[PDB]
Amino acid sequence: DVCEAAGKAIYIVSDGTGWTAEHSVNAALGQFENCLADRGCAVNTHLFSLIDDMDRLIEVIKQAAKEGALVLYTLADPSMAEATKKACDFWGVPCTDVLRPTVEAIASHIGVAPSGIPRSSPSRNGRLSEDYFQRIDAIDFTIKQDDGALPQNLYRADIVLAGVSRTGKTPLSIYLAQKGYKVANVPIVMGVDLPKSLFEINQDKVFGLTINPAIEMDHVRQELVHANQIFAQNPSWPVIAVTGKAIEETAAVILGILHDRKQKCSMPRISKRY
Amino acid sequence: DVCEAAGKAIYIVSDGTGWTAEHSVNAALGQFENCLADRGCAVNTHLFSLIDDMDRLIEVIKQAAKEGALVLYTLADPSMAEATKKACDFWGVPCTDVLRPTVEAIASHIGVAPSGIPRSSPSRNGRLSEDYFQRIDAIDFTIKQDDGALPQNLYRADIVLAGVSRTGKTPLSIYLAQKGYKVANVPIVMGVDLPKSLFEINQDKVFGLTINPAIEMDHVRQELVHANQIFAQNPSWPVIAVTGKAIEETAAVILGILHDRKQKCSMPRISKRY
Numbered sequence A, B: 001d002v003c004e005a006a007g008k009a010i011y012i013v014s015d016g017t018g019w020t021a022e023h024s025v026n027a028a029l030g031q032f033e034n035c036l037a038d039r040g041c042a043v044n045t046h047l048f049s050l051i052d053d054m055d056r057l058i059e060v061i062k063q064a065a066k067e068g069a070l071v072l073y074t075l076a077d078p079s080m081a082e083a084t085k086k087a088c089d090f091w092g093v094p095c096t097d098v099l100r101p102t103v104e105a106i107a108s109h110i111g112v113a114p115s116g117i118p119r120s121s122p123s124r125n126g127r128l129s130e131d132y133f134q135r136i137d138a139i140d141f142t143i144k145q146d147d148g149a150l151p152q153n154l155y156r157a158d159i160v161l162a163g164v165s166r167t168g169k170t171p172l173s174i175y176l177a178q179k180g181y182k183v184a185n186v187p188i189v190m191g192v193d194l195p196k197s198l199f200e201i202n203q204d205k206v207f208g209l210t211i212n213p214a215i216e217m218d219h220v221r222q223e224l225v226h227a228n229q230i231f232a233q234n235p236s237w238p239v240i241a242v243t244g245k246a247i248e249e250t251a252a253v254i255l256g257i258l259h260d261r262k263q264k265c266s267m268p269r270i271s272k273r274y
C-alpha cells in the first residue's frame, strides 16, 4: 500500500539531475560512518530530479514534510531557492542550498553574476563541449580492447595499468576514461610474457598496481612476488597498493602523479582550462 | 620555466580526493556558461588532493595567494577548516568550505556530531560496503558483453537500452553500471532481426533511445523511421531523445522511470537505504 515513518530521511532536490547534491550528500555521510556502521544512526536519500517549477516544488516539500525529512537542494533560479526555504519554514522542515555558497564565491571572484538558469531550461540548452567529446573517444578506447592488440594501444594510451588479476583494473580503467584518459590494461600473470612494447613506450605513463595479501591456493602469493620482480626491474613505475582503497581514491593518486610529471611544476596539481 | 599571471583561477582543495568539490565547482560553472561561451570570463581549476596536514595546507594557500586564486575546499577536520579561512585572510584571498553546510544540516537532522575525520585517516580506513561491490559486478556485466549472447543477458539485466547506432549507448550503459545497474544494449539496425528474448523479458525495463535528426547518406533517416516502427509496436517502452542531452541527464530520466515503476508510489523518486 505505502512503498516507504521513522529512519531519518534526506531529500535531495534539483532543477536538473540531482547528481551534484547526491555526491556532496554521499561525501558528507562519511562524517557519520562510525555510528552508521552499527545502524545506530540510519538514513535514506530520496532524489527528485527536474523539480523546475513552483507546483512540483511545493508538492515535494509538502511530501518531505509528511515524511519528516531534511531538504538539501540545488536550484539555479534565485526565487525558487527563496521559495524553498520559505515553504520549508511554513511546513516546519529543515533545508540547505548546498551549492549557492560555491556559486556566489565564484561569482564574486570572476566578477560576474550567475545565469540564474537551470540546465533544464529551453534557452541555452544542448551546446556540449570539446572536453565532453574526448571523454567519449576515451570511453570507447578503453572498453574496446583485447589481449591480441595491446602493442598498438600501449603507444596510443595516456595511462597504462600493469598489475595482477586480483587488482581492480577494469573499474579503475573505466573510471579514468570517464575523466578523459585512454587507459590500457596489462595483466601481470605467471606463465605469460609481457609485450616488448610495454617497455619501449614512454615509461612515465605506466602504473603498477598491487594487493596487500593480508587486508592452499596461495600460488596467489607467488603471483604477487612475481609482479614485484617486474616492478623492481622498472623502478620509474609508481606502484600503488589498491586493496582497501576505492577506485576514485586510487584514480586521484595516479592522476596526481601523471599530471605532476605531464606539466613539471613547483607545486604539484591537476588543472583544467575553461 | 613556469608551467602556468591572469585568467581567474579556482583552487580546489581536499583532505581526500578532490572529486566532490570538483563536481560542485563544475556544476556551479554552469551559472556562467554564457560569458564563458566567448571566453569573456575565463577560468582554471586546480586540484589538490590529500592536503591532510598543516604544512601542505599553508604551502598551498600561499601558492594560491601567489597565483591570485579563490579557494573552494573540503576538510573534515574542524581546525583545518578554521586554519584555512584564517590563513586565507592573512594572505588576503577568498575562500569557501563547500561542504560544511551540508555536513552540519545532516548532523542536526540525524542528531549526531561529525566524525571530524578525513577518509585519508589511518583510523576507520578501508572497510568498503556491499553497495560498492554490486557496482563492480554491474560494471563487469556491462562491459563483458557481445552480439552472440544477448538472450541470456536480457533476462539478467536491470536496464536495457534499445536504439540506433548513432545514439550513445555505450557511455550511457557504462554510466549506469557505475551507479550499480546491469545494462544490456540492443542495437536497432535495418537488416537484422531483434532477439525474440527482447520481447519475452519484462517490458518495463526496456528503454528506447533516439536521435532528433535536425539537432546523400540519409539512409540515416530511414534507420530512424525503422526504429520508431519498433517503438510504436512496443508502447510500454519509454523513448528518450538523447541528442543534446548529456549522459548524466539521460541517465537520470531513465532511473526516474525505472524507480517510479520498481517501487510504485504516490511521489516518484530514487531512494537508497544507508
Ligand SMILES: Nc1ncnc2c1ncn2[C@@H]1O[C@H](COP(=O)(O)O)[C@@H](O)[C@H]1O
Binding pocket: A014, A015, A016, A017, A018, A019, A020, A021, A074, A075, A076, A117, A118, A119, A120, B026, B027, B028, B029, B030, B031, B033
Ligand atoms: N551546464 C549547466 N548549465 C546550467 N546549469 C547547470 C549546469 N550544470 C549544472 N547546473 C545546475 O547546477 C545544479 C546541478 O545539479 P545536477 O544537475 O543535479 O548535478 C542544478 O541546479 C543545475 O541546473
Ligand SMILES: Nc1ncnc2c1ncn2[C@@H]1O[C@H](COP(=O)(O)O)[C@@H](O)[C@H]1O
Binding pocket: A026, A027, A028, A029, A030, A031, A033, B014, B015, B016, B017, B018, B019, B020, B021, B074, B075, B076, B117, B118, B119, B120
Ligand atoms: N567515507 C568517508 N569517510 C570519511 N570522510 C569522507 C568519506 N567520503 C568523503 N569524505 C570527506 O569528504 C570530503 C570529500 O572530498 P573528496 O574525497 O575529494 O570527494 C573530504 O574532506 C573527505 O575526507
Ligand SMILES: [Hg+2]
Binding pocket: A084, A085, A086, A088, A089, A093, A094, A095, A096
Ligand atoms: Hg528551511
Ligand SMILES: [Hg+2]
Binding pocket: B084, B085, B086, B088, B089, B093, B094, B095, B096
Ligand atoms: Hg577566506
Ligand SMILES: [Mg+2]
Binding pocket: A013, A014, A016, A017, A018, A019, A020, A021, A022, A074
Ligand atoms: Mg543536484
Ligand SMILES: [Mg+2]
Binding pocket: B013, B014, B016, B017, B018, B019, B020, B021, B022, B074
Ligand atoms: Mg573534495
